[PDB]
Design a binder for these strands. Structure first.
Length: 432
RNA sequence: GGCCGGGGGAACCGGCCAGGCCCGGAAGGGAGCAACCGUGCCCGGUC
């Protein structure tokens, strides 16, 4: 399905084939792999659109192959496309806790809970679960298993068709025992469509107990359709976050998670399916990225921020008076990094300015000629304690020759630079 | 004179050694600056 699109990814890392066309196809191509894999479309237009939008309103900051950029963008919107951005907060508000597990008809219904709970114990906490469902059979049962088979008791009431009590009952139990976290799956007679009734149930269910964290769930089996279901409820309870049962358990996915999002919906996990652990957290990227996997750039990318927003320092530095601050003639060497990591060397140098920046400065038609000597200035630095570069004025012949040799460079080179530092500023610092 | 800590040091040659520096085609090694690690390093005790 989609997966094999995440290939279009490197299928793209091919200088052989041209551009633009390369794009749109891919677009459509990826674009295809989606709906085909469930995925609603009404939306799409929007994405595919926004996508376009940008193009005719941007360009990759120089010093960086377009093809790549494209992605950041692609990726970029994949995010928004899906669970845009809000980093779900699945951990303790306080303790203990109330996990109201509202489920349509079964499906992950119970299961889920497991790894969920399961998960948090291998986090180090007094879980606690309860069979909060009496319409469909194997409540405890099938579940019951794991419970012990994981070292986590649980509790319920054979036959016994009546939530609330039992729930209430359970609850305070662990509580009385003072455990830390409770999980309790529930549901009712009529769900999908009669959703109205499902929730209708959760109504009391909720407002009777007084749960802190509440969640619904669904298998991508339903997909984009689901939307609604959940939707009606985001209203019931906005704090209402959810997850999608079965990943490896369908083939449609997308639309599922898609629809979700497109409601302001709130997820947290997903779990491929079987196995007591397949459950996983969740953060678009986490996944989006995941369906593109190798997304380095972001890295090399983010270095811009390193540089771009660092000259920030330069000019004049420190603010106000008194107390200790940060760093600077370190930031010196700091500059370094970014770039090299921010994509290979050279191409960039050329593609962009020296190290000062752009003021009443010296040296020809274009600022530089560090070309090689560059990866030399570096030599040391890392050949020196932190403090050193903070007090770039304690460079005794003694303390340095070691860096000299320690970095492998016969003296000279250094002394022969130390000033390209204490003078830079000198001039640099020449603010009126 | 037995132990955990707040901080705790360039260069009298320490553990891992990046970076680079050097010998050999690549292998892989050679000496080693920081870097964390502790020596050390000053005080409190050590159910």
């Amino acid at each position: 399905m989609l997966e094999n699109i995440r290939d279009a990814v490197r299928k793209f890392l091919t200088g052989s084939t041209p551009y633009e066309k390369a794009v749109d196809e891919f677009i459509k191509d990826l674009q295809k792999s989606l709906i085909s894999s469930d995925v609603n479309v009404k939306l799409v237009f929007s994405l595919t659109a926004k996508i376009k939008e940008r193009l005719n309103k941007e360009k990759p900051p120089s010093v960086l192959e377009r093809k790549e950029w494209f992605i950041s963008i692609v990726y970029d919107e994949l995010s928004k496309l899906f669970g845009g951005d809000k980093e779900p907060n699945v951990n303790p508000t306080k303790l203990p806790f109330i996990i109201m597990l509202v489920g349509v008809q079964g499906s992950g219904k119970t299961t889920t809970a497991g790894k969920l709970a399961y998960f948090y114990k291998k986090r180090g906490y007094k879980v606690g679960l309860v069979a909060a469902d009496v319409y469909r059979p194997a409540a405890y049962d099938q579940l019951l298993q794991l419970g012990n088979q994981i070292g986590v008791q649980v509790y319920g009431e054979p036959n016994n068709q009546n939530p609330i009590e039992i729930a209430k009952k359970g609850v305070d139990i662990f509580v009385k025992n003072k455990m830390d976290i409770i999980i309790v799956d529930t549901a009712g007679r009529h769900g999908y469509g009669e959703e109205t009734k499902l929730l209708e149930e959760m109504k009391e269910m909720y407002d009777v107990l007084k749960p802190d964290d509440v969640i619904l769930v669904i298998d991508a089996s339903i997909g984009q359709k689901a939307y609604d279901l959940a939707s009606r409820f985001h209203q019931a309870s906005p704090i209402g976050s959810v997850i999608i049962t079965k990943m490896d358990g369908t083939a449609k996915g997308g639309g599922a998670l898609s629809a979700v999002v497109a409601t302001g919906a709130t997820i947290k996990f997903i779990g491929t399916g079987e196995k007591i652990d397949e459950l996983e957290t969740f953060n678009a990227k986490r996944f989006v990225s995941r369906i593109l996997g190798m997304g380095d750039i972001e890295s090399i990318l983010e270095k811009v921020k390193g540089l771009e927003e660092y000259d920030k320092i330069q000019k004049k530095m420190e603010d106000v008076m008194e107390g200790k601050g940060k760093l600077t003639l370190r930031d010196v060497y700091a500059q370094i990094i970014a770039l090299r990591k921010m994509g290979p060397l050279s191409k960039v140098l050329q593609h962009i300015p020296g190290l000062g920046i752009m003021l009443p400065t010296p040296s020809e038609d274009q600022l530089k000629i560090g070309e090689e000597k560059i990866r030399r200035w570096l030599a040391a630095l890392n050949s020196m304690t932190y403090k050193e570069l903070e007090n770039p004025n304690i460079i005794d012949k003694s303390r340095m020759r070691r860096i000299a040799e320690g970095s492998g460079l016969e003296v000279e080179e250094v002394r022969e630079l130390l000033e390209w530092y204490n003078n830079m500023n000198r001039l640099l610092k020449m603010v009126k």
